[PDB]
Amino acid sequence: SRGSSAGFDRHITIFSPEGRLYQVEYAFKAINQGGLTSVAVRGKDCAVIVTQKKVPDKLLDSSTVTHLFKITENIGCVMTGMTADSRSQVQRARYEAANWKYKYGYEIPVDMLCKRIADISQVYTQNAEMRPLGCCMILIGIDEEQGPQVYKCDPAGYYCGFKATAAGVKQTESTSFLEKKVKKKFDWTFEQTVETAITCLSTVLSIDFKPSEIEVGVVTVENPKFRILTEAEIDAHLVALAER
């Protein structure tokens, strides 16, 4: 124990002598290969997803570079980690949701969609022949009873709902930023949700963003359809922040 290894326990998802799954641990490292960080925050009125948008190559059509994805009309997502893996996971989520609506006559709750994707990822941690997906999914939507929701699932098949959360390279630092900010708030609840998200991201990276360097997605109690902010809309937030 303490970093012990027997047999093929670093190559496939069998247990190591401490009871760890090294291949699952290595899939969390794959999340950071991309070099990106995402943040998500929920208030009483809305939920927001913010992520870095890095377009190093001028020859890219930057309108095709996104990590924000519509899953249904009311459920949005930000993906962090290996891109092709992420896309595949987004497709599966779209399928699960559409399937749920066809069979059950009402939209999949965000918690259930996150649970299902997490249960599917679980299978990759117990069966030896395939690897986990090296990506992390954060889902936002409005629940009719519970209000705005933020849910995250990971390559271990763990999932949870959050007041706010993060993924990718600066996840820990974001978690500290967000933790410290909520303890301050009455009823431990965020209120300026887009500003908190962008500020968190901006601090942990030390950047001070241009509007083309981030992407912003929202769902609101008044407007539950998932919406992507334009550059101008993001700029209005950036400017309003800069001026106090």
Binding site: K103, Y104, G105, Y106, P109, M112, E145
Partner: protein, 220 residues
């Protein structure tokens, strides 16, 4: 069979008779035709009895699995889709004709579901061999937004019409009243039919029946 349902101001009233027949013989005088789907959703059944029993049990069971997972009260639409998609798949070979009613987060809902898988969402419906007698009562007397007791009166009148005018229907009237606040499964609601009494007694004393052979096996 006569089964029926109404949407009233605060909920649903379902009704049913209690006769089951085999050919033109009464096999059960007190069959229970209003089946549990979930604590907030019930379903009257007509048609082939094993089919209505098994279909409602299966969907109730699958709904319980669903609500255990979701942690939420199930929806009437969800029962309706599951029932109708299964019945369609079987092409009308599962002879279940259903009246599905309940109360979910979006309020009261009532559907009739046919064996071949069509459904109709409506504020009053009837099914079974007595369904036209029951529907006459509804067309004549139904009003939107009835109070609970008026709704209960109307349903039980409609079931009575089927009981008295259809040879396939009889015996008792069962009701199930479902609101946001309450579930009243009223079995029997009314007993409008009773066997007459027995005028002559046939108490056959021991030895009346001749016996060829006898074995007593004692038990623990």
């Amino acid at each position: 069979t006569t089964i029926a349902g109404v949407v009233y101001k605060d909920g649903i009233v379902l009704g049913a008779d209690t006769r089951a027949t085999e050919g033109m013989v009464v096999a059960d005088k007190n069959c229970s035709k209003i089946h549990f789907i979930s604590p907030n959703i019930y379903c009257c059944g007509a048609g082939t009895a094993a089919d209505t029993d098994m279909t409602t049990q299966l969907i109730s069971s699958n709904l319980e699995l669903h609500s255990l997972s979701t942690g939420r009260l199930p929806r009437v639409v969800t029962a309706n889709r599951m029932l109708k998609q299964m019945l369609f798949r079987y092409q009308g070979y599962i002879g279940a004709a259903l009246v599905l009613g309940g109360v979910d987060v979006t309020g009261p809902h009532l559907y009739s579901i046919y064996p071949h898988g069509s459904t109709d969402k409506l504020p009053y419906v009837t099914m079974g061999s007595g369904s036209l007698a029951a529907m006459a009562v509804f067309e004549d007397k139904f009003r939107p937004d009835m109070e609970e007791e008026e709704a209960k009166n109307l349903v039980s009148e409609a079931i009575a019409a089927g009981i008295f005018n259809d040879l396939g229907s009889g015996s008792n009237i069962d009701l199930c009243v479902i609101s946001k606040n309450k579930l009243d499964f009223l079995r029997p609601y009314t007993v409008p039919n009773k066997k007459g009494t027995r005028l002559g007694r046939y108490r056959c004393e021991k030895g009346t029946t001749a016996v060829l052979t006898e074995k007593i096996t004692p038990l623990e």
